[PDB]
Design a protein around this ligand. Structure first.
Ligand code: CLA
Ligand code: CLA
Ligand code: CLA
Ligand code: CLA
Ligand code: CLA
Ligand code: CLA
Ligand code: CLA
Ligand SMILES: CC1=C(/C=C/C(C)=C/C=C/C(C)=C/C=C/C=C(C)/C=C/C=C(C)/C=C/C2=C(C)CCCC2(C)C)C(C)(C)CCC1
Ligand SMILES: CC1=C(/C=C/C(C)=C/C=C/C(C)=C/C=C/C=C(C)/C=C/C=C(C)/C=C/C2=C(C)CCCC2(C)C)C(C)(C)CCC1
Ligand SMILES: CC1=C(/C=C/C(C)=C/C=C/C(C)=C/C=C/C=C(C)/C=C/C=C(C)/C=C/C2=C(C)CCCC2(C)C)C(C)(C)CCC1
Ligand SMILES: CC1=C(/C=C/C(C)=C/C=C/C(C)=C/C=C/C=C(C)/C=C/C=C(C)/C=C/C2=C(C)CCCC2(C)C)C(C)(C)CCC1
Ligand SMILES: [Cl-]
Ligand SMILES: [Fe+3]
Ligand SMILES: [Mn+2]
Lengths: 335, 113, 60, 432, 26, 28, 38, 77, 37, 28
């Protein structure tokens, strides 16, 4: 030996590893591994979790009669609020399972691990000496997860207001959220929608255009590695029917005539989009709701005329009253 | 560290009992004297300077003595703010008396326990 | 009283001619020597004027 | 010079000021005039629509509450007792902006481009460690003195608005903060999670003033150090030493101060009284339950001797630590503390007897008033949930404060990464 | 149940200390 | 009224400051 | 592309006049709608 | 030919600074004289409801549709 | 409201808070004046 | 009946992960 520390540092920072294990990665594997082992055990076999603190539970496990679509990891009890609730603060194992302990374990380790993934990205890109900005493009789903799992709960006052980890659980969260805050008319959610449809659309456009122009591609290969001449043949003419549509829309909006603005714009669109909606979800965490119109049209007789906004307010009311077991005397509320 | 020089000391029970007897005798004072108006000035300031100095400690909220005298000082102060220049019913003087007695009993029974 | 209104009106129309006056006095390269004096005495006047309206505020 | 050929455009015209030290001083000092101008204008504009008998949060006041907490213009009970102090600060800011603006337009249209070949005492560069550490040292000492201004206002010029006095809150002069560091630095060892809170759990003005004593003196101490002490070897190898980097380092701190500012305004109640800002998040709900408990007990039958169709609690229930708290969807709240609620608690929490016969007038009216205007908001400033009709209008000023400062904090995180990458790219160089 | 408390504290400090000593190990 | 005049004046003072400079060559 | 001489009708000419004339009519409509009292 | 050059060509200005106001004013009068309501069949805002009726006009037959609208309009609905 | 020996300035303050933004607005016209860089 | 089917299909996905990482086709 050379005294294990020197071997250990070479082992960690090696880029000849099949899977890079950096110094972020050294935190990342235990956290992500804990999160996933707890998740699959909980999803399969966590007994029903009381979620309103009235001793009426909800089953999310698969051995208690769910399928893939109806199952979930049920969030923490409403009694707990925002308290930190490790397993040694409970007094028995069965009551830690009855109050929804594991859910907090999963999300805390998951956010740590998914942050370290971004770190590990930045570090490896630093070793190969390339412009390290793949990480800022990833910071958009990461920002989104902070907003949905950590911040909206804090803003409302409890982790009982978090998103369940399950398929129908997400749908339940979405519907209830629209009921209490009117997300559709929030302009930031609109920026979000725009961003992901536009991302999908520009993905199809780019792909279709590129695969029509490529001709043949070959790069020299050796018996242990790769070559140093990347050959590539493409078509190099286009017509004036993609000059009134593509040419004088893109040269004018990109602010360049250069091809290097294509791939800069491709990533900018959805990233900005998902930041905007990630920001919006947090502003409703402090209850700044979106536009809603009731009684924006009245005639000069003094009778009200309805509009589409009022129909959506009716449907929202319908969802919202169904969500409320707690009392029938509630005038003005949340949080 | 560091208590006010307005009479108080660091040992709660002592300056508490003192403050209790002071304001007991103070509200026991006739209203046909022109010093009553003066009395309310020192009453109000010593209320504030006790409560704000002793509210800070977290331990003594697990006692009953502090929690009950708190209510007492609060009712006194609330009537003070409710009618500044008008004395208060003797219903509330009996109520104030009640919880002073029970606070005193509680201080003395927690001294040994 | 009359003198207090005279001051506040005078101050606001003074500040309003001065807000155009001071940048161009610095900006113009032609005859900076002559402009420096008037902006000096105007600044003096303007702070004096806010004092007198402020001191007559306590009587009005 | 004054046209392209320095490597930037006209939307990075600001970037032409990096080496032009006099113009750069000019831009900052003129910008500072704008901040003061906005303060003065907004305050006067807010006074002009203020009614001095209707509270400071159904109208949309956001900056006169800041004046009120310094004890200016409020008497005992949390009311307005004349609107004249608001006017004094309003026009004081407004006129000082003039002379700020005068010096700005002077240094940015006439003054020397280079302040290094004027004098060496206001000269600087972004590579000379000694000048820049002296500027930092001066800014530290003046900030430390500024912090001590609030212990002065709290001690000598008539106290601050104490929310925890027993009349319902009133102005009070602090004549004893606590300097025993075990409290002051103790808050920073709390966990941020519920049941305690981090430093957004502080709840008496004594810790506030005493912490200000400690921070003021330590800031002046560090400011005395950083004039007489040049940067050390390990330090000079750790960072980049360029001029845009310092702006990056600053941006990284302002990002964090934003998120904790939102926590401060949204949760805390002692350095943000609830009679000048609206009801807090938890306290609204708590008041609603307490008002209802009183109402349905004095008319009808008791409900803290009766369990409902819930199977645990009806109006009162036990916590996960066995403590009597409100029931409903408001059992997520039991850490809350307020000046109107504590006189109803015993050592075990709520005792229904106390709720029956220890109610004072201000408690009950304040609670029912708070209950009506729970913190809801929207961009068109329509009251209630975004299902309700135009029958009630309200947004809580706390909602606005929190949301805007959170949004800008995120954008400063983007800008921090932007200037960080800029600095690193410049300093490495790669072909240098 | 307290052995659990100490085993998580211990294993956690181990991982955190090797990550912080790692960035100073070049 | 004599209380709309200033809002009217203020509102048109912007381009005056720059038109007076384009003549007096304090900028091009 | 289209000759610089540009006779009165041109592919370009109709394209920019079937998106100019209705819009100036319609923006004049909407502007008038702003001062209708509810 | 760049659009900037033909837009600031004298030939454009001489005709178009006469026709542009005419179009803006023609739109403005199409709304202001009350005609916009009479061409597109959009009700005036004091008249969506009849005196007698508190119910909405609703179509219930396709071949006697215009007949049902003609009836609804005479009763001032 | 304002004091009523300063009360004529009710309309004046209805526009004060927005002159900051008009400074940004003036910046651009300075760039439009010099035809840009 | 149903749940065994669910976990078996899960298990062979994660196995397929392992196969795609440590046994990819050598591209020559
Ligand atoms: C708080 C302190 C702060 C300071 C002092 C700086 C300082 C600096 N930044 Mg900035 N920046 C910050 C925060 C800060 N930044 C934040 C929070 C972000 C994220 C938004 C950025 C993002 C940013 C970018 C992306 C760029 C700079 C650049 C610059 C530098 C060059 C000069 C320049 O053009 O600036 C002034 C900037 C401009 C004139 C650009 C204006 C661009 C638009 C489109 C803004 C319009 C906003 C407007 C209010 C919206 C409504 C308008 C309405 C009429 C429709 C400069 C010294 C530029 C540079 O070259 O850096 C070296 C460059 O490319 N900055
Ligand atoms: C809002 C804040 C702000 C501030 C404080 C500055 C400040 C500065 N910029 Mg910048 N800039 C800004 C916004 C700002 N800019 C924006 C929004 C843009 C986008 C358009 C730019 C684009 C830009 C460019 C293109 C350039 C600068 C340059 C400069 C600096 C050099 C001085 C100069 O060339 O003046 C010349 C200006 C004049 C001759 C006229 C100035 C008029 C004055 C000072 C006052 C007008 C307001 C008011 C009436 C004053 C009343 C005063 C009274 C109350 C006392 C100056 C320090 C320049 C530079 O880098 O120089 C090397 C350069 O060429 N900037
Ligand atoms: C960021 C801090 C901040 C906060 C929290 C507030 C909060 C408040 N202001 Mg205010 N204000 C601010 C900064 C701020 N202001 C600044 C910098 C200006 C001067 C430019 C003003 C100018 C101002 C005026 C003129 C008025 C208020 C008023 C009010 C209050 C009433 C609600 C209302 O109309 O709000 C409106 C909310 C805001 C102005 C906060 C920011 C709004 C955002 C970020 C909108 C941006 C829209 C965007 C450009 C385009 C659409 C969205 C896009 C995504 C598609 C509210 C309590 C009103 C009042 O009467 O108070 C009693 C009123 O009329 N403020
Ligand atoms: C906030 C930062 C700041 C800074 C760093 C400067 C820096 C400078 N300004 Mg200044 N200025 C500012 C804000 C600032 N200014 C503002 C807000 C205004 C409007 C009021 C002005 C108006 C102004 C004018 C009109 C002039 C300057 C001048 C000067 C320069 C000459 C050096 C000199 O004599 O200094 C020291 C200054 C003096 C001896 C003159 C004033 C003495 C006074 C009244 C106050 C003393 C303040 C303070 C107690 C001194 C601290 C000393 C310290 C070592 C402890 C210097 C480069 C002058 C110059 O030479 O510019 C080319 C000049 O003509 N400035
Ligand atoms: C890279 C590290 C770093 C960081 C994190 C900062 C951060 C900061 N700098 Mg900066 N700076 C740096 C390096 C850095 N700087 C270098 C190398 C230079 C050149 C010398 C500068 C030059 C510089 C200038 C020129 C200025 C700053 C200022 C400031 C601060 C003001 C922002 C504000 O409003 O907060 C409000 C500010 C505070 C609350 C600060 C007081 C902080 C307290 C009470 C204690 C600090 C305790 C410390 C963390 C304990 C650990 C010490 C360690 C040795 C163990 C911000 C905190 C500005 C300033 O003067 O602020 C006063 C300013 O003008 N800095
Ligand atoms: C000689 C030391 C010295 C001193 C005293 C100052 C002082 C100051 N500089 Mg600074 N500066 C220095 C050297 C110094 N500088 C050097 C060498 C340079 C390089 C050329 C600069 C460059 C510089 C820049 C670029 C900037 C400053 C700014 C500031 C001021 C803003 C702080 C504030 O708002 O305080 C508010 C008040 C307190 C926190 C407490 C005040 C407590 C007491 C008792 C003192 C009151 C007097 C003092 C002069 C401040 C008066 C403020 C006035 C509005 C009332 C400030 C007081 C900035 C600014 O905003 O200036 C307008 C800015 O952008 N300075
Ligand atoms: C606010 C402005 C400011 C600025 C810019 C500086 C700038 C600097 N100081 Mg300094 N300092 C200041 C104020 C300031 N100081 C004050 C007020 C004090 C007195 C309290 C000190 C005392 C101090 C000393 C004694 C020394 C420095 C040193 C340094 C320099 C080296 C870099 C460094 O170590 O960063 C500071 C270090 C870090 C940022 C790294 C450690 C970070 C910590 C401790 C984070 C721990 C996080 C914690 C566990 C998280 C809890 C979260 C919670 C939610 C639970 C740098 C030039 C050294 C130097 O060269 O000075 C010339 C030196 O000898 N500083
Ligand atoms: C230069 C320099 C500097 C700077 C400084 C500064 C920044 C300054 C500022 C200053 C200022 C900025 C000041 C202030 C001004 C203002 C004033 C002082 C005000 C006045 C007013 C008054 C007093 C009031 C009045 C009134 C009354 C009384 C009543 C009625 C109303 C009225 C408003 C009219 C330094 C030191 C850094 C450095 C060195 C150099
Ligand atoms: C550089 C530059 C810039 C910037 C600028 C600035 C930033 C400035 C500032 C400035 C300022 C910052 C200003 C201020 C002003 C103010 C004034 C001018 C005022 C006046 C007034 C007064 C002084 C008061 C009065 C009164 C009284 C005393 C009482 C009663 C009421 C009254 C109101 C009447 C720009 C971007 C634009 C452009 C480019 C360049
Ligand atoms: C008691 C009290 C108080 C006070 C408090 C205090 C005293 C606070 C402070 C606070 C603070 C003062 C905070 C902050 C701290 C600091 C920090 C948080 C730092 C950080 C740092 C870092 C994280 C680092 C990083 C790094 C490394 C490691 C390497 C190199 C590079 C870098 C820089 C990246 C008050 C007034 C509230 C009132 C009530 C009571
Ligand atoms: C002292 C005083 C005062 C003063 C004030 C002043 C300082 C004035 C001036 C102001 C100003 C200085 C203003 C300005 C204005 C400006 C403007 C308003 C403009 C803006 C811009 C724009 C609107 C834009 C435009 C454009 C066009 C048009 C086209 C294309 C391009 C562009 C977009 C650029 C007063 C009265 C408060 C009273 C108390 C005291
Ligand atoms: Cl539900
Ligand atoms: Fe591609
Ligand atoms: Mn909810």
């Amino acid at each position: 030996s050379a005294n294990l520390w020197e071997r250990f540092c070479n082992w960690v920072t090696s880029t000849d590893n099949r899977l890079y294990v950096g110094w972020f990665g050294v935190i990342m594997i235990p956290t992500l591994l804990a999160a996933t082992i707890c998740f699959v055990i909980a999803f399969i076999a966590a007994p029903p979790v009381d979620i309103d603190g009235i001793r009426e539970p909800v089953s999310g496990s698969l051995l208690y009669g769910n399928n893939i679509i109806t199952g979930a990891v049920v969030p923490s009890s409403n009694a707990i609020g925002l308290h930190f609730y490790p397993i040694w603060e409970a007094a028995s194992l069965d009551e830690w399972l009855y109050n929804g302990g594991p859910y907090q374990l999963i999300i805390f380790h998951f956010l740590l691990g998914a942050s370290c993934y971004m770190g590990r990205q930045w570090e490896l890109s630093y070793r190969l000496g390339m412009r390290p900005w793949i990480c800022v493009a990833y910071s958009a789903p990461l920002a989104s997860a902070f907003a949905v799992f950590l911040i909206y709960p804090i803003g409302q006052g409890s982790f009982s207001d978090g998103m369940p980890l399950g398929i129908s659980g997400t749908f339940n969260f979405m519907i209830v959220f629209q009921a209490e805050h009117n997300i559709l008319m929030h302009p930031f959610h609109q920026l979000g929608v725009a961003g992901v449809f536009g991302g999908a659309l520009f993905c199809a456009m780019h792909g279709s255009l590129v695969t029509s122009s490529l001709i043949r591609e070959t790069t020299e290969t050796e018996s242990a590695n790769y070559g140093y001449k990347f050959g590539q043949e493409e078509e190099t003419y286009n017509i004036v029917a993609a000059h009134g549509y593509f040419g004088r829309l893109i040269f004018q909006y990109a602010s360049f005539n250069n091809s290097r603005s294509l791939h800069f714009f491709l990533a900018a669109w959805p990233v900005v989009g998902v930041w905007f909606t990630a920001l919006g979800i947090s502003t409703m965490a402090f209850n700044l709701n979106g536009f809603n119109f009731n009684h924006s049209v009245i005639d000069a007789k003094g009778n009200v005329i309805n509009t589409w906004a009022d129909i959506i307010n009716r449907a929202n009311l319908g969802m919202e009253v169904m969500h409320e077991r707690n009392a029938h005397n509630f005038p003005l509320d949340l949080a | 560290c560091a208590n006010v020089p307005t009479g108080l000391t660091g040992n709660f029970r002592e300056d508490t009992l003192a403050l209790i007897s002071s304001l007991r005798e103070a509200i026991a004072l006739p209203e046909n004297d022109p010093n009553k108006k003066a009395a309310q000035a020192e009453a109000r300031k010593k209320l504030n300077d006790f409560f704000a100095l002793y509210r800070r400690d977290d331990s003594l909220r697990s006692l009953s003595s502090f929690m009950t005298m708190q209510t007492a000082l609060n009712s006194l102060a609330g009537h003070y703010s409710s009618y500044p220049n008008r004395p208060l019913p003797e219903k509330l003087k009996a109520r104030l008396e009640q919880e002073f007695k029970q606070v005193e009993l509680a201080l003395d029974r927690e001294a040994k326990s | 009283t009359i003198l207090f209104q005279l001051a506040l009106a005078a101050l606001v129309i003074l500040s309003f001619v001065m807000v155009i006056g001071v940048p161009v006095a610095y900006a113009s390269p032609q005859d900076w020597d002559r402009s420096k004096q008037l902006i000096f005495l105007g600044s003096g006047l303007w702070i004096a004027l806010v004092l007198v309206v402020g001191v007559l505020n306590f009587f009005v | 010079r004054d046209q392209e050929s320095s490597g930037f455009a006209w939307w990075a015209g600001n970037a032409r000021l990096i080496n032009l030290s006099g113009k750069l001083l000019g831009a900052h000092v003129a910008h500072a005039g704008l901040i003061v101008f906005w303060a003065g204008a907004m305050t006067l504009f807010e006074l002009a629509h203020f009614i001095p008998e209707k509270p400071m949060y159904e109208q949309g006041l956001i900056l006169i509450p800041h004046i009120a907490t310094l004890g200016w213009g409020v008497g005992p009970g949390g009311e307005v007792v004349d609107t004249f102090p608001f006017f004094v600060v309003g026009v004081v800011h407004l006129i000082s902006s003039a002379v700020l603006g005068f010096g700005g337009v002077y240094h940015a249209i006439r003054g020397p481009e280079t302040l290094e070949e004027y004098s060496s005492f206001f000269g600087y560069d972004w590579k000379d460690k000694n000048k820049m550490t002296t500027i930092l040292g001066f800014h530290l000492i003046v900030l430390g003195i500024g912090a001590l201004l609030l212990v002065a206002k709290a001690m000598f010029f008539g106290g601050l608005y104490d929310t925890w006095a027993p009349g319902g809150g009133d102005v009070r002069v602090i004549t004893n903060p606590t300097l025993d560091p075990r409290v002051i630095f103790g808050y920073l060892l709390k966990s941020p999670f519920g049941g305690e809170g981090w430093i957004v759990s502080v709840n008496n003005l004594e810790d506030v003033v005493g912490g200000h004593i400690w921070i003021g003196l330590i800031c002046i101490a560090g400011g005395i150090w950083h004039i007489l002490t040049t940067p050390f070897g390990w330090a000079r190898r750790a960072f980049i030493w360029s001029g845009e980097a310092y702006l990056s380092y600053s941006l990284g701190a302002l990002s964090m101060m934003g998120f904790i500012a939102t926590c401060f305004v949204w949760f805390n109640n002692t350095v943000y009284p609830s009679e000048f800002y609206g009801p807090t998040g938890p306290e609204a709900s708590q008041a609603q339950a307490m008002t209802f408990l009183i109402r349905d007990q004095k008319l009808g039958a008791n409900v803290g001797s009766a369990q409902g169709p819930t199977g645990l609690g009806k109006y009162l229930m036990r916590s996960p630590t066995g403590e009597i708290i409100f029931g409903g969807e408001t059992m997520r709240f039991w850490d809350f503390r307020g000046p109107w609620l504590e006189p109803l608690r015993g050592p075990n929490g709520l005792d229904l007897n106390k709720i029956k016969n220890d109610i004072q007038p201000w408690q009950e009216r304040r609670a029912a008033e708070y209950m009506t205007h729970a913190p809801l908001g929207s961009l068109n400033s329509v009251g209630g949930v975004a299902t309700e009709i135009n029958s009630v209008n309200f947004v809580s000023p706390r909602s606005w404060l929190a949301t805007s400062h959170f949004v800008l904090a995120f954008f400063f995180l983007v800008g921090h990464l932007w200037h960080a990458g800029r600095a690193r790219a410049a300093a490495a160089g790669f072909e240098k | 149940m307290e052995t659990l408390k100490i085993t998580v504290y211990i294993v956690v400090t181990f991982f955190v200390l090797l990550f912080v000593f790692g960035f100073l190990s070049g | 009224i004599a209380q709309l005049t200033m809002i009217a004046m203020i509102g048109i003072a912007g381009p005056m400051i720059i038109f007076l400079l384009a003549v007096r060559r304090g900028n091009l | 592309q289209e000759p610089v001489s540009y006779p009165i009708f041109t592919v370009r000419w109709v394209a920019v006049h079937t998106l100019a004339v209705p819009t100036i009519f319609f923006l004049g409509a909407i502007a008038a709608m702003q001062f209708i009292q509810r | 030919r760049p659009f900037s050059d033909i837009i600031t060509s004298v030939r454009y200005w001489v005709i178009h600074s006469i026709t542009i106001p005419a179009l803006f004013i023609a739109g403005w009068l199409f709304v202001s004289t009350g005609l916009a309501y009479d061409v597109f069949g959009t009700p005036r805002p004091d008249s969506y409801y009849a005196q007698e009726q508190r119910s909405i006009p609703l179509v219930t037959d396709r071949f006697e549709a215009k007949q049902q609208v003609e009836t609804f309009l005479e009763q001032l609905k | 409201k304002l004091p009523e020996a300063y009360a004529i300035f009710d309309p004046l303050v209805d526009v004060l808070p927005v002159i900051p933004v008009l400074f940004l607005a003036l910046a651009f016209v300075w760039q439009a004046a010099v035809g840009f860089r | 009946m149903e749940t065994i089917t669910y976990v078996f299909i899960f298990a062979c996905i994660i196995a397929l992960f392992f196969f795609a990482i440590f046994f990819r086709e050598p591209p020559r």
